[PDB]
Design a protein around this ligand. Structure first.
Ligand SMILES: Nc1nc2c(ncn2[C@@H]2O[C@H](COP(=O)(O)OP(=O)(O)O)[C@@H](O)[C@H]2O)c(=O)[nH]1
Ligand SMILES: Nc1nc2c(ncn2[C@@H]2O[C@H](COP(=O)(O)OP(=O)(O)O)[C@@H](O)[C@H]2O)c(=O)[nH]1
Lengths: 308, 388, 446, 440
């Protein structure tokens, strides 16, 4: 049995290792529904996602055992809640695999649990990055947003500030991803690859694999910082939705013809932008506070936030 | 021992497929007794209308033999009887009547049967003289639906005839014009009945029988193929994916035969198919597990067959009505335009009867749907919802 | 009952329709273009029925059943020369007289009064080939002249000779307001017969045909003759069930019986995802929601304020029944209907033709729907709102040959009066049926 | 994730030759278009689909569309890669514009033939499903090439709203005769200014200097310039061609770089370790990150003075250490400065060495490259721009190449030129305002 390639096949599903290709495809296909389903998922009715995955899985190579056992499952209690089962609604989906015949003595069930949790977190981040990216694509391509001589107040207070805060959010999100994937994930896969060389004891192999996984889990960026990130995600979700609405909202602000209309709309838009911005300033400052309060992520994440 | 077992089971499966036509008798039983391939049943009823309704006894069995002859001749199943290779199949069909009474209860007791012989009579579970005759229970339970279908079709045609007939009156007494409206509205009533029938039938033939038959053929067929995927995998109803068998080495040279079914597995799987059909909540009659529902307190099949009988009386009375319209046209088109029309009195009487029966029908059906919603089971709940 | 069908081809466009239709049909059953078997006789088992449509001889040639109609042997001969076999040359028919469109309806009518005296006898001889005959058919475009006249005369002639026999119709409606000087005349005349002769009628809207064709064709925009093959694709889905027999609907009568309530309401709007021609990777769920889509129709003229009276659905392909259950749930949750109804939409799951040049389908299905809905009369309004403004003026009032109906201008004007009354009563009844008290005529008696 | 590449002009197609050469031998193809792997059954570790089309017989067709006017120069490439390039993708004029012409006649030809060019691009589009954007590779100085590039650029941008565009541009070294091309150059900017979403600029002075440093015995090394250009383009697309954790689409790359679409001119730099004596000066990632900030590594020869940075995006390819990179940012944030009105934006994009070129692996060898956003970008304009502020009034030889959509109707010609130069002035003052701390 070729253990090495089976481990790599598992990783490409559960760590994203050399597979961001796949995550991009998955999100770009199903984001339009995954964005809204997670409000009232008690009554499942999620036939479309299951059916679509069933169809797409037929296309893949049959000479990969692992992709075949990929199943879509859901549950109710959320991510911080499912971590509350580890040390005591955004994307509460799940992937699991029932490891094959009792050669799976190599691969436990606890390890599958932690792999599940990890993939859940990765998909959260990738979803938010995909939103920001679609937003950037919208801000610089739809002619509605191009400047053709409107009013110095609207730029000072609507569009320029919108762009500034959008770029701030995107920089922060990408920085979080950069820290996590670069100084968190490659350590484990690199150790696992090196222990494949000169192998002497199976039990040490099992111990090293689980040690790498646990060392992934121990990071407080998954446990202690996480409510900050969820409040972050609420803010960014709402802002991105607002901008997606602005794409057509801006259409009625120019030479209806400023006819005692949209003036309070302009004022409310200004206040909305201002309040969202100030909220995000406070939240980043508190994130700074917890960063400074107590892993090369130090002087790595904080560079893009620390205000000049 | 291992080698001999493997070899003998393999040769046995091969001979069953190749000499005695297994898997052709199974599909034949589904296409004959379990009501599939309906055109055969349609042609049978059409060619046996004169006899299924004969109000007599000591019936000429010879005509029924001619009936099965021309029935298998008319349907698509002639493609079997024409071929020498599998001609043996058609020989097994036969028809029976049991006389517990005089009055054309033959239509109520017409039974299609299929007699088996060695070796197959040993492998397949059929109307054994000391069995439960499950095939017979199913076949009667669906023959009811088929009686409804036949009568409704005939009389729908006679209806459309008669409405088209009265359309050429408008230079006459508008009372006859009234007929039009009434008949047209009356027609909708009939359809509200008939459609309901079909709904349930479809569920029966597409959610009880067919799904089970597909599972039986899938299990019996999996032995036939070669590895289109090298993972002998099982897909479940809960999304569970399990790999049984041994994860074999990938043809590794470290140093310098698959599972088909014996006879008992064959009989076992056929019996599983049948009993799992008859353990479904739309067939069970007499156990402790005959759980009755709120608002009725009755078994589902009992109330349902009551509904179907009510449907039958509706068909009879609507037949009478259309008859009445026919002789009204007959007397109207001729000389006597001073025509006595106590026939109209009968017309109104029969409308009153029809509307009474229809109100009773809707009431019973509402009880029925509420009963299924009380049941709470997903498929029965969806059947209840679909009926609305 | 339940048996053989005889189909009728009205006009030149209709005859093109039929040529494409029988192309598709014989393609489905793997039939040789010359009519000889395209299958090696290695297998002797066959699991579908071609007795309803075809006949067979001692030489295993398939004799079609059809009749091909016009006075101009151009289109007939073109179809015949398209397939050097595949047709019996003794079942065509052509007249020998003057030629014109429009009000030549009347002369076309006279064609029958001159010629049906033998034409049906041809039919009769042909119908004597079989035993169990269950209905005719007809293909037509309302707008043209020769087809409209012959079709109407045929319908009248058959409605009183073969009782208890079904007559279905297929009719397409034009989109141009140009020829309305005569156009909206023939149309209205045709309706007069489709209200008294058809046992069920399907309606088409050429505007939506061309719109969908341009939307889906990956070749640039071209003629309507290459769009004609989008008619037969619907007539494949109907009669699919009686060509590959399965559990239910093995007869045509039962089909409209689940379509058509009381005989006054016999207009049907087809629709389905034209996922084929002569890909799209859609599952059953996608198909059965796409059929709800207001962009998906073959008569796309209605406002989103409709009322369905009856719905037929079908699917070709292997399908998970659970998806059908879920989709019935969803569709019933989204559609509207009168409160005197207790039935619902119906589903039949068919069989994909097995002789087809098949790859693995992987649960990719081909849906279809017929709907008896309230908005069909919308496709009428253009021709409802045109002819009368000309009738006040009588443009082209003379294009009738005398025959034995055109002797008095009042004769024609009374014809149009009757016709408009017929259509108005139709729309009156369709509107009246929408209100929840339609049954009061019989449920509030003393 | 399909990408469509447009190459035009003599320079554009020389670029295409070298570019597709490096990309192909990066993907084990060879001059024929078949697999060089010994076993077709084994799966691969990348996705070549974003740039190459695939058939049944395992021939890879580069989705590359090339434009020309005198088919001789574009003809050489298929006379080097037999059967590789699809010949229906090329387009050849007949008796069009003059030798070295102004862009005007090329623009006229483009307006005449854009119908069939658009049909061509449409039929290449129909070939796939997941289309992400185009790429345009040409110089501004060349007349017919830049006219065609401008015309098709407008055609793509207005016909295609949901698709990204990236252009690569070439500028001549400061020399004598380009006083016409540089002249001509101005109007070319007009299109990229309004139509390009992101774009990176190339000058030949720094290219020649890099050649004078890397290769021995230099006589004429324009081919070396194309070498460096392809090096840069492949490096940019590396993280998309060999998937990794984060960046798997082009939009995700630029989205970190460009604020409001008035600041989308980018300036590259690269490690001395090339991609065609290379064994030296690749010491470490710490070294790579440090020497990236050498002004001598710029692909545009600028001046060094407390440079003001908008966005920094560097990619390091090879086997890297976390500690080196950590310390590198630790002191580069301190050394590198950016305007106080925004925040620090340093991004690293660790990638993959291609496992199909038989590389010479060391344990700590790396290479690196970087994209940046600068004020000093406007410096390339002034060098050309200052010129026509001095000459255009005389027009004796200036009108003679007949620079306009009409001929000899020089009134509308001066209209075009004036509006163009004022648009350039808007760009320059805009970059200054971003510079001048005014929003502070
Ligand atoms: N769908 C479709 N309709 C057509 C086509 N050609 C003509 N028609 C319609 O058919 C009508 C003409 O009918 P016509 O053939 O003249 O009738 P005929 O004179 O009795 O043969 C016009 O209203 C057209 O809109 C076609 O290729 N496709
Ligand atoms: N990109 C690139 N451009 C070059 C190189 N060498 C010279 N050039 C410039 O590229 C331009 C190409 O001009 P082009 O229009 O294609 O030549 P033409 O077709 O003869 O008019 C010329 O103006 C050269 O100055 C090189 O190595 N690479």
């Amino acid at each position: 049995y070729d253990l090495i390639n089976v481990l790599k096949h598992l990783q490409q599903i559960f760590l994203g290792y050399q597979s961001g290709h796949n995550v991009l495809k998955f999100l770009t296909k199903n984001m339009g529904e995954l964005t809204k389903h997670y409000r009232n998922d008690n009554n499942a009715n999620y036939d479309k996602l299951l059916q679509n995955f069933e169809l797409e899985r037929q296309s893949e190579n049959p000479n990969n055992l692992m992709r075949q056992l990929l199943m879509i499952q859901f549950d109710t209690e959320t991510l911080p809640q499912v971590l509350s089962h580890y040390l005591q609604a955004i994307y509460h989906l799940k992937f699991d695999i029932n490891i094959p015949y009792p050669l799976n003595i190599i691969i436990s069930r606890t390890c599958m649990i932690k792999y599940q949790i990890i993939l859940r977190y990765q998909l959260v981040l990738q979803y938010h990055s995909r939103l920001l990216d679609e937003t950037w694509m919208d801000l610089n391509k739809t002619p509605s947003w191009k400047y053709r001589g409107y009013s110095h107040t609207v730029k000072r207070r609507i569009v320029r500030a919108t762009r500034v805060l959008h770029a701030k959010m995107n920089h922060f999100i990408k920085t979080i991803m950069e820290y996590f994937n670069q100084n968190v994930i490659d350590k484990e896969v690199y150790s696992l690859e090196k222990c494949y060389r000169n192998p002497t004891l199976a039990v040490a192999i099992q111990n090293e694999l689980e040690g790498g996984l646990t060392n992934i889990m121990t990071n407080r960026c998954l446990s202690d910082l996480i409510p900050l990130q969820l409040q972050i995600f609420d803010i960014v979700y709402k802002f991105c939705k607002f901008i997606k609405s602005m794409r057509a909202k801006l259409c009625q602000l120019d030479p209806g013809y400023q006819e005692d209309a949209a003036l309070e709309l302009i004022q409310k838009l200004i206040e909305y932008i201002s309040n969202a911005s100030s909220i995000f300033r406070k939240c980043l400052i508190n994130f700074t506070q917890e960063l400074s309060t107590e892993a090369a992520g130090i002087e790595r994440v904080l560079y893009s936030i620390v205000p000049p | 021992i291992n080698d001999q077992y493997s070899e003998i089971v393999n040769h046995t499966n091969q001979i069953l497929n190749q000499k005695f036509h297994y898997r052709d008798v199974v599909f034949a039983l589904k296409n004959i007794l379990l009501m599939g391939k309906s055109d055969f049943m349609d042609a049978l009823i059409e060619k046996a209308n004169d006899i299924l309704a004969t109000p007599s006894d000591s019936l000429p069995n010879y005509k029924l033999t001619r009936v099965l002859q021309e029935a298998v001749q008319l349907s698509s199943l002639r493609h079997l009887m024409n071929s020498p290779r599998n001609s043996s199949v058609i020989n097994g069909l036969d028809a029976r009547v049991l006389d517990l009474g005089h009055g054309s209860v033959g239509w109520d007791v017409f039974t299609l049967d299929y007699i088996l012989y060695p070796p197959l009579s040993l492998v397949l579970n059929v109307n054994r003289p000391f069995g439960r005759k499950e095939y017979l229970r199913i076949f009667n339970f669906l023959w009811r639906f088929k009686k409804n279908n036949y009568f409704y079709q005939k009389e729908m045609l006679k209806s459309n005839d008669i409405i088209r007939s009265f359309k050429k009156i408008r230079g006459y007494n508008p009372l006859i014009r009234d007929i039009i409206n009434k008949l047209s509205r009356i027609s909708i009533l009939r359809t509200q009945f008939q459609q309901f029938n079909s709904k349930m039938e479809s569920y029966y033939l597409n959610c009880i029988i067919e799904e089970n038959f597909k599972e039986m053929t899938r299990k019996l067929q999996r032995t036939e193929n070669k590895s289109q995927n090298q993972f002998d995998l099982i897909r479940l109803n809960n999304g569970t994916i399990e790999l049984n068998g041994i994860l074999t080495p990938k043809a590794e040279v470290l140093t310098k035969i698959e599972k088909t079914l014996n006879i008992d597995e064959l009989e076992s799987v056929h019996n599983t198919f049948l009993t799992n059909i008859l353990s479904h909540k739309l067939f069970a009659t007499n156990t402790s597990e005959i759980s009755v529902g709120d608002y009725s307190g009755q078994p589902y099949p009992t109330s349902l067959v009551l509904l179907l009988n009510s449907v039958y009386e509706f068909v009879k009375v609507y037949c009478n009505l259309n008859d009445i319209g026919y002789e009204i046209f007959i007397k109207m088109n001729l000389n006597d335009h001073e025509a006595s029309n106590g026939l109209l009195g009968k017309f109104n009487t029969n409308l009153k009867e029809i509307v009474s029966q229809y109100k009773n029908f809707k009431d019973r059906l509402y009880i029925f749907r509420a009963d299924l919603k009380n049941d709470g089971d997903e498929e029965l709940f969806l059947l209840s919802k679909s009926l609305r | 009952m339940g048996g053989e069908i005889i189909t009728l081809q009205a006009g030149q466009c209709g005859n093109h329709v039929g040529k494409f239709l029988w192309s598709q049909l014989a393609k489905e059953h793997a039939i040789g273009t010359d009519g000889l078997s395209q299958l090696p006789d290695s297998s002797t088992e066959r699991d579908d029925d071609t007795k309803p449509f075809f006949r067979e001889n001692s030489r295993n040639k398939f004799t079609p059943r059809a009749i091909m109609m016009d006075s101009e042997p151009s289109v007939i001969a073109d179809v015949e020369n398209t397939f050097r076999g595949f047709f019996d040359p003794r079942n065509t028919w052509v007249a020998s007289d003057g030629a014109s469109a429009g009000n030549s309806w009347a002369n076309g009518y006279d064609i029958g009064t001159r010629n049906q005296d033998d034409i049906l006898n041809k039919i009769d001889k042909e119908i004597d080939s079989t035993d169990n005959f269950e209905g005719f058919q007809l293909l037509h475009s309302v707008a043209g002249g020769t087809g409209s006249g012959l079709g109407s005369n045929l319908l009248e002639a058959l409605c009183d000779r073969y009782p208890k026999k079904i007559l279905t119709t297929y009719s397409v409606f034009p989109a141009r307001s140009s020829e309305v000087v005569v156009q909206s005349y023939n149309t209205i005349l045709a309706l007069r017969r489709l209200i008294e002769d058809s046992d069920a009628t399907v309606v088409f809207d050429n505007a939506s045909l061309l719109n969908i064709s341009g939307k889906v064709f990956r070749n640039p925009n071209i003629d309507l003759q290459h769009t004609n093959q989008l008619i037969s694709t619907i007539i494949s889905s109907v009669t699919n069930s009686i060509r590959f027999p399965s559990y239910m609907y093995s007869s045509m009568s039962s089909i409209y019986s689940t379509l058509i309530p009381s005989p006054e309401l016999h207009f049907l709007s087809p629709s389905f995802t034209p996922f084929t021609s002569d890909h799209k990777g859609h599952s059953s769920y996608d198909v059965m929601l796409d059929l709800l889509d207001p962009s998906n129709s073959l008569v796309s003229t209605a406002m989103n304020n409709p009322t369905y009276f009856n719905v037929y659905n079908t699917i070709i392909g292997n399908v998970e029944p659970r998806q059908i259950s879920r989709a019935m749930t969803k569709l019933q949750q989204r559609i509207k209907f009168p409160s005197w109804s207790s039935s619902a939409m119906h589903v039949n799951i068919g069989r994909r033709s097995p002789y087809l040049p098949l790859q693995p389908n992987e649960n990719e299905v081909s849906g279809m729907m017929l709907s008896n809905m309230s908005t069909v009369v919308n496709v009428f309004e253009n021709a409802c709102n045109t002819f009368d403004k000309v009738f006040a003026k009588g443009a082209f009032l003379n294009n009738y040959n005398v025959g034995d109906l055109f002797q008095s201008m009042q004769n024609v004007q009374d014809e149009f009066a009757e016709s408009r009354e017929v259509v108005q009563s139709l729309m009156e009844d369709y509107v009246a049926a929408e209100q929840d008290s339609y049954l009061d005529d019989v449920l509030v008696d003393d």
